Amino acid sequence: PETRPNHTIYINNLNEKIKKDELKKSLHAIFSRFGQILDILVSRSLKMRGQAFVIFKEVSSATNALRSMQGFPFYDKPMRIQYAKTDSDIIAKMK
RNA sequence: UGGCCGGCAUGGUCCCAGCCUCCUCGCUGGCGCCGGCUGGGCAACACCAUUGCACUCCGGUGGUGAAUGGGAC
């Protein structure tokens, strides 16, 4: 069951050998051109590694990002993007 | 030596170069042989496992079972 459009894109299949600080940096390097980014959440725990939550200010940015960067080779692996199942807190504290 | 001990071997103090290491990365650490017991930590590194939807930091295991020569007194 696919997911509905969201402010936050959920990326997975990421290179797990990349430190947290660097991944957020590089992800911002390539995703900032799609619109303002409120935050990029990354955890290297057993359950959350290889995944990231990019939080865009406007849904159109997330959408563009999702369509434009699907399968993009990043740290030698094709990035798999989806919309986040639910809003991130940063988005709730507003809209 | 991360903490502790048993055996053996070994003239000393320095000075230069090379090398080693999970646990005070270097010049007021170390770089003989052999044996047993043991603490901490996944922080770095490595290996294993993991394709996982969060907004609570949080899988596991490994290492020192290491590293040479030269010079001056």
From Swiss-Prot:
Domain of life: Eukaryota
Reported impact of N12V: Abolishes RNA binding
Residues found modified as N6-acetyllysine: K57
Subcellular location: Nucleus
All residue ranges annotated as the RRM domain in the record: 7-86
Effect in UniProt of substituting T8V: Abolishes RNA binding
Assembly: U1 snRNP is composed of the 7 core Sm proteins SNRPB, SNRPD1, SNRPD2, SNRPD3, SNRPE, SNRPF and SNRPG that assemble in a heptameric protein ring on the Sm site of the small nuclear RNA to form the core snRNP, and at least three U1 snRNP-specific proteins SNRNP70/U1-70K, SNRPA/U1-A and SNRPC/U1-C. Interacts with SFPQ; component of a snRNP-free complex with SFPQ. Interacts with IVNS1ABP (via BACK domain); the interaction is indirect.
Protein family: Belongs to the RRM U1 A/B'' family.
Function noted in UniProt: Component of the spliceosomal U1 snRNP, which is essential for recognition of the pre-mRNA 5' splice-site and the subsequent assembly of the spliceosome. U1 snRNP is the first snRNP to interact with pre-mRNA. This interaction is required for the subsequent binding of U2 snRNP and the U4/U6/U5 tri-snRNP. SNRPA binds stem loop II of U1 snRNA. In a snRNP-free form (SF-A) may be involved in coupled pre-mRNA splicing and polyadenylation process. May bind preferentially to the 5'-UGCAC-3' motif on RNAs.
Full protein name: U1 small nuclear ribonucleoprotein A
UniProt organism field: Homo sapiens (Human)
Gene from which the chain derives: SNRPA
